[PDB]
Amino acid sequence: STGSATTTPIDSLDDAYITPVQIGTPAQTLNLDFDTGSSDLWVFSSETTASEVDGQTIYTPSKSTTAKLLSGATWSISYGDGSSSSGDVYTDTVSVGGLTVTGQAVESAKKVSSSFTEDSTIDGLLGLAFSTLNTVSPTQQKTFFDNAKASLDSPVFTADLGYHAPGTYNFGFIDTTAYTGSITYTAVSTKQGFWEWTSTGYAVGSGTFKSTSIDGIADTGTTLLYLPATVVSAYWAQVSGAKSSSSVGGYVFPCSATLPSFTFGVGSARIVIPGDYIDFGPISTGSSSCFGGIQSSAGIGINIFGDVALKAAFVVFNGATTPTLGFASK
Template sequence: MRNVFLLPLVPAVAPLVAAITLHKRDVPTVVELPLERRQTAAVLSRRDSSVGVSISNEGQTGYLLNLTLGTPAQTFSLGLDTGSSDLWVNVANSSLCSASDDPCKPFGLYNASASSDYKPVDAVFNATYAGGDNAYGSYATDTLGLGSTKIDDFQFIIAESSTDTQGIAGIGYKISTYEAEHENKEYDNLPYALVASGATKSAAYSLWLNDIRSGTGAILFGGVNKAKYHGDLQTLPIVPVYNRYYSLAIALTEVSVQSSSSSSSYSDNLPLAVSLDTGTSLTALPESLVNKIYKDLNVTYVEKASAAYIECDMTNKDYNVTYSFSGVEITVGISELILDATEEGFPTGTCIFGLVPSQEGLNLLGDTFLRSAYVVYDLENNEISLANTNFNPGDDDILEIGTGTSAVPGATLVPSAVSTATGNGATATGSVATGSTITATITSTGDSTSTAGTTSAPTSGSGSDLTSSTSSGLAAMSTTNAKHLLSGLAGAGILLMV
């Protein structure tokens, strides 16, 4: 989901002892690529020059992945998005990109006639994202370049019309591509195409966004880098929707705020399925939960701006916000939650706070969470592995992700994790869920294996029924340009209320 900014229930458990297959090779079958963080100058007004980001292109923020398309190669910088699945690029003759100031040019413009490997595909793309952005075009294939890696006949979208000056590199499930959902035709999007080409062994990748002061991060397709996280990776099941896997979401079970002198834990509206979304700048959680965190940290939310502010000097305090997932804890320091930027009308000396109330059930752990977490997205096994980020890594220690179960090296399954969800009742029109009502249930299982198609009575760890509903209007996030593709089934994190 591209959400361009405006933005103990279960006790801790001991690691499960299991056989772990390590895939250490002299030359691992992986593809590692740098990510560039870009932040908007229009919405965010920097207080000083200390933020290590490139300010360019009004209305854009997030992490950009550089790649090429075509022969000879045409260069692109696309927004990396775990919340959608298609890769699309702009063309020069679109209404947006043909403006006199040429706003799309810094991110790349595709020219089909200039590539000898271009081939059209008889399928159209007409996607609407939360926040109102949309793109229309047609599918094609061409040669894709990722560093030294080449993929022949890679399928992507040429956006003849869009409301975004940069394209998107969606790396979610291939079942969630527009063509799969609307034409019932699956194709290998980027994670799967890397496997088909032999560049990686598995449709899995790890993400390291570095700290908030850094302008770069990295994505590692097909591997993990042990130097970039603390402790051990712990593996949780992805929560399915309608007995199938559409969204890269796991169950959040507790949030707490700590300082050297106090600690408060909250479980409002939890357990909750939350998407780990690189396309979202901020983190969005239920209002009742967010308000308690605001009170602890003296944060003020301004509805008109759809943003919150906090005293900038709070960045030097010893507060942390800890997110728990069936006992797996990721700690986010207060300095990682305070953006060195402000909104028009915010009081002098205040900065934007990286947590906002979710709207219309769109619950997301965005960049203000992901920078503090090393995340391994294992699409093959429907699992996500987590560890706390090492912001000061030493020499790389890269291990290959293999095939089969327990494929992520050094990762341990979490026992009794909140793991399954079933739902029904949704309807969709076009690519936007309208008038949908989703009833979801989750259970705590004896192990952490996700089981699609569960029909047992819905319970939480405490035996409470868990239900949820979402309504139309998921795009109503006023100062955000959410890039999470609202495709009826894969739209948002499903609220799992006790």
Template sequence: MHSFTFYIHFLVLLPSLALALPHGLSRTRLSRRDAGETRNFTVPIYSRKRGGAGAAHERRGTYSGSVGLGDTADLFYTVPITIGDTDTAVNLDTGSSDLWVVSDACKTNVCKTSRMPAYPSSQIKPAGGSVALQYGDSLTGTHAKGPVAQDTASIAGLSMPQQPFAAISDTNNTSVMNGANGIFGLGFPSSSQVQATVINSKFNSPTKTDDFVLGTTQDGPLLSRLAASGALEQPMFTIALQRDTIDIGGQSGSLTVGKLPDGVDNSSLTWVPVRLYTPKLGGLNPPSFAPNEVYPLRWEVLLDAVYLDGQKLADSTVAPQGISNPGLSALIDTGNSILRGPSDVVSSILRSVSPAFAANRNAAPTFPCGTPHNLTFQIGGKMFPVDPRDFVSQNQTNDATTCIANNIVNTDPPSAGALFSWSLGDPFMKSTLVAFYYGNLTHPSVDPPRIGFLSTVPTDAVAELDQAIDDAKENNGNFETTSQIAPTGSASEISVAPSTLAVPTAVSSSASAAPSAPSSTSSSDRSKNGAQPSAHLSTVAVLSTALLSSLIWTLF
């Protein structure tokens, strides 16, 4: 299931309104980043800090875990999870933040087709309130509704007690029909409606975000809680997606929690900061104990440029909606099965690769299978190509001569709460190992969130595509395709106790309060006008002083 969804978040409406969103150190100091400042990191993992604001999140433990992924024809990537006594599988989605599974109370047509174990409604332990999660773009959409419950949740051999999740009793989300029984959102707490619902219930719809920020350790998303617990080796996770179409193989699909995968060296990744969202543009209002902090909303990074077959593509001229130019950025989204970009840039790409589309924009963007194309994203000064095998798709059965470029489509223009102009989904992720580092969730300036990228495209990728075409011709013109069931975890079961945070002393997130940050990489210092935050998060009423609506894409 691909989740490229737009969440509509209403900041500060009614106190009881639930927002619907449903992703070697140098001595250079990292100051509080505003809309026009960003740095690239070469090494993101800090040694332990002692004392100071946010120190509770700087503890480092010894636990980590890894688990393989299921894959339905490169469309839906799933991971096994246990909630209470129910062993099931959920769609892996870095583009959203909430965990939900279907309960046996769901009787919709989609739920009736699911072959995965449903969560018993008789075992629901209410955590307070209910959610109505919305997924979809401006043209399509799905929903998932149900009460917020809590139970022990286990992922990759790591177990967290009293984990809030949504026990869905009404959904039309197609992930349920494709090897999953729900969605596992790995995004930041600021986009979690489940957490917001619990906090509103516990604290009677607070008008400040203090309880929400501090409540992440008890009521936040599963991986955020694990990161905040101090029990993990590092507050991070890494995703590698396998390839099950065109040419089966590539990376060994896995989710690694708490560290980099075995055999992967930290210095081999290109690390860049996650874009932060200010309240003015939909980000989280800072709590009173950290009034100068700016928080991340989703796993979004700045792009240097986009290239096709070695040529830099012109910047998009599509105007953003209701905001000034936010610069070039991308959402890194495993829930999105394709690539999405600005309409004019996507049209330019399709005209370049497809003679049929160049002649008629209503025509399918077909092109010769044997003509490889290199779509590359420059991030942190380095090039990250999409493997040519992940750029092509079979156009018609029994035909390995004419392929189609249907892995790239238009996306909506940037808007408040959704500043990205690209969504890099599974084709990019199949070509790149990606590490997601939460950092300090209460004081991001102390240990900023970032993402590390490592290209896994082989030097002989073109030859591999040629071989795949030859194999397809020998198979009556049909490319390889398969599906895999989500396997079991490799780590032994370890129960992680949630930490409890006291209100920290107020601290400024200015340069003087920030710790040493990794040195910047070679890419030019890019100024972005407005790392404008997205309308984010929870149902904590009064998250912002403006009512912002933002879409967050999620293609299911």
């Protein structure tokens, strides 16, 4: 089997991407944030505290003929941005892009933090990191990908995120029309439960490539590119008037600037992030200070290849017995 679903930016900045997901019978379609940095599929629901719901579409298990309470199971998750959610668990039929899993754990939120409530466009998350990170207790649950894997034509999914445009998540196949040149594969460590890999270095603009190992994660659920302070300082030093602002919470730059590209290494291959991808616009409405898309990972404890980096590539998440990542230009 295969599945193919379009993923759409939630706003004009590509802050996140939403993908429609069918849950239950008859189908209830929710728009979920596919997150390769977490392992819970959780939804706004008929159980969510009413004051914490503001415009989201909810899953109502009582209206699904295939929903069953997973008795005694609870979940609670905290993300890198400080957001959180928790609740109880149902099993139900879940379909993505025509690919169906029966018996998927659908984590029903009873509580969500303010950042979720305030984002009316995101009806929940679909985690695509390794199932070792799933938070359901006392019986850990599998991701949608892990439950689909054995049925797929190939044990893979691909992320093809757009810049200010829709893109695609495919399950079970490589679309050889979706990228240019060849795919370069690189080793993955699953020790922390993430798609963790080592970049071979970077370049700023037209500068020379610096060969240096940068361990990080491929995380579709993180907006920005978070790299070591040395690398980030080297990038922003090429932008006149850029500075790190403790008041704003990272590097800002004059909105009048033209940003340089950023290149990262994948083995001997190179992925180029255009300068435009690194502009996250005014820090507040009407400001002439703009927020940077490359930020320091110091204090986060891991480097994160978030959407800024991933949307410059066609990315293969290879869930074979030995997992690997692949990157191609596009």
